[PDB]
Design a protein around this ligand. Structure first.
Ligand SMILES: NC[C@H]1CC[C@H](C(=O)O)CC1
Ligand SMILES: NC[C@H]1CC[C@H](C(=O)O)CC1
Ligand SMILES: [Zn+2]
Ligand SMILES: [Zn+2]
Lengths: 373, 373
């Protein structure tokens, strides 16, 4: 009864947009932050807790899931949604980045690699990546890509991007060939081209000619720094179709997100709130804090005194400081819940401010406070 | 408005009893199982989840808390209940066992020891143990004791027990001297004497002459085995005042609990459900299972198909198998919630069967199924 994929822009301010993506398993409010659920879990959180923070969609990692527990096994057990107990949309990455980063023989067919878990040999290609994502049952499927190497010659960046675009076409065809997947899921293409404007334009042109439900900006946050990332976004996002969502992969810190929204990004995923939470870093409106620091040992205030999350209604900095220092699982649980909730509250403030035509003021006020610490 | 400590026996069957302990922070249904909350947390569970499993009271470890975060610090922050977010009764052990086990110079005054965290030197005595438990704000205070060495000569067991009894009297006096503690908390004494009937009798006589709110059987589950433990319980529990609760410290497996209740024990604590849960062992009515075992990789049944816990309503063995094998925090969370809930359901079945005069049949039926596997 619900649409497969319908993106509606409710309001704009400059290059920033806010709206909704309607899918069969639910609505995604944009700009959206996707918690990362690597191995079929958002680390340290039950799915009901993830939803309670405000998340509309989560990300799964194809590379990890294809190795453990395996895509065929997850399919036999009813698909990823049933397996993990999350009934809302899931976006899966293609695996093309982790094979190169977490594993390796690359050719036009795909990449063959050795598993980090045990050294067993495996293969990923556009067709196999799409089939794995089909078996997982994910709602948003990412085309199999290659991250343009950084730094690299313009010619190496170009040949990499061109291969990635041929892989995008192969991914489109594989997805379209599977009727159940084509009728129930969406397919996003990934723009490559490193920091080179002409290559980003050629990539965008190729992707629009193939046609996708959404367009990701790939190849960023790979060591170039925020200033350069924003410079590339300045020219790259306008090259993508305006009427489809724009997804910045693997970004980022709160200030990265705000600046990327100012440049036309609608969707984000990042390991920071979960991973840094487990390591003792909490995000607050006055900047990040390291909760293990001695200054918090007797601080009875919550992590953030304006945060609406359940953790900040019930527990102090002093208690969470103790838990993390003692290596207690509850410390990781509470830090992660707060950090994901903080990210969702940030996204809500972004959406409301764009809707209300006051996003420029919000971004200025946010930065002045977040960086004042 | 509520009583400090009021124990009522509602029903008996043989040596087994069921009833309630009413305290200012709540009612404890007996026989009772106390989850162990070492470092101001029941590992991997929020307090609301602990309560949802049916627990009425939890245990804190004085030795750990006095080292990290420290008793004075917890007191400055409002006491242990506020610090951890558990508003119901807490029982604290005395520290007398862990100093000897987890750390050491023993004299009549107390024991001086080196901390396992850093080698700093510390002191525990009856008076200091009581003061630490006062600063923590615990509801049931344990007298500072010495575990009778096992094995040991009857004469060494006797001298150890006699020292423990002098320490019990010192603990009573220190507790009574602190009006706020005496008016709001309860004090339990610990019977010692190893496996020797005459020493257990002398210990019980000494404790009853001092007078306590409850009586623990100490010095068991120290390597003697279940048959010998039950033999000692057979003669030791009847020596304690019948009209006060009987607490078996550090026990145990489900079948240990059932047999101890048959011998007159009203209260238990054990690390097994939490620690073994994190390590992949789940308790079921058909015996323990090791969820990491390959046989569970595609098992869509819950951990136990008759368990009422939230985990067994929502997640499969196959998913929990995957989580534990992958080292995921959510695996520990789900295993621990189920195991504590299983222990609470066991206690509820014990209480109902005693109340209903069918505990002997319950114990027989429980054992036949649990050991059939
Ligand atoms: N720094 C994260 C980023 C790495 C490259 C990846 C890709 O281009 O596939 C997108 C995410
Ligand atoms: N095996 C646990 C048991 C160890 C001795 C202790 C004590 O006697 O203080 C009670 C608990
Ligand atoms: Zn919060
Ligand atoms: Zn269960």
């Amino acid at each position: 009864d619900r649409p497969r994929f319908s993106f509606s822009i409710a309001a704009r301010e400059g290059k920033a947009r806010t709206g909704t993506i309607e899918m069969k398993r639910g609505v995604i409010r944009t700009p959206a932050f996707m918690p990362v659920g690597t191995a079929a879990t958002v680390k340290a959180l039950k799915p009901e807790t993830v939803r309670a923070t405000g998340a509309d969609i989560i990300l799964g990692n194809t590379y990890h899931l294809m190795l453990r527990p395996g895509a065929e096994r997850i399919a036999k057990l009813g698909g990823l949604h049933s397996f993990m107990g999350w009934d809302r949309p899931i976006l899966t990455d293609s695996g093309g980045y982790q094979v190169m980063s977490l594993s390796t023989k690359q050719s036009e067919e795909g990449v063959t690699f050795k598993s980090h878990l045990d050294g067993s040999r495996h293969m990923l290609s556009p067709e196999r990546s799409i089939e794995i994502q089909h078996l997982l049952g994910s709602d948003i499927v990412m085309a199999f890509d290659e991250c343009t190497p950084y730094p690299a010659t313009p010619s190496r960046a170009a040949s990499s991007m061109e291969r990635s675009m041929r892989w995008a076409k192969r991914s489109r065809d594989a997805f379209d060939s599977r009727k159940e997947q084509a009728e129930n899921a969406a397919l996003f293409g990934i723009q490559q081209g490193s920091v080179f404007e002409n290559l980003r334009q050629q990539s965008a042109d190729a992707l629009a000619e193939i046609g996708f439900d959404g367009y990701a900006v790939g190849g960023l946050a790979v060591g170039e720094g925020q200033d350069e990332m924003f410079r590339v976004l300045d020219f790259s996002v306008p090259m993508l179709p305006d009427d489809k969502p724009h997804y910045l992969m693997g970004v980022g810190k709160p200030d990265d997100i705000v600046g990327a929204v100012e440049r036309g990004i609608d969707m984000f995923d990042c390991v920071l709130p979960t991973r840094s939470g487990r390591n003792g870093q909490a995000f607050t409106w006055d900047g990040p804090i390291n909760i293990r620091n001695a200054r918090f040992s007797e601080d009875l205030k919550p992590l953030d005194s304006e945060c609406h999350c359940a953790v900040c209604q019930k527990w102090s900095r002093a208690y969470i400081h103790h838990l993390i220092r003692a290596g207690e699982i509850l410390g990781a649980m509470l830090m992660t819940e707060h950090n994901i909730a903080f990210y969702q509250q940030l996204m809500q403030k972004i959406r409301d401010s764009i809707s209300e035509g006051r996003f420029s003021q919000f971004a200025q006020d946010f930065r002045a406070r977040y960086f004042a610490r």
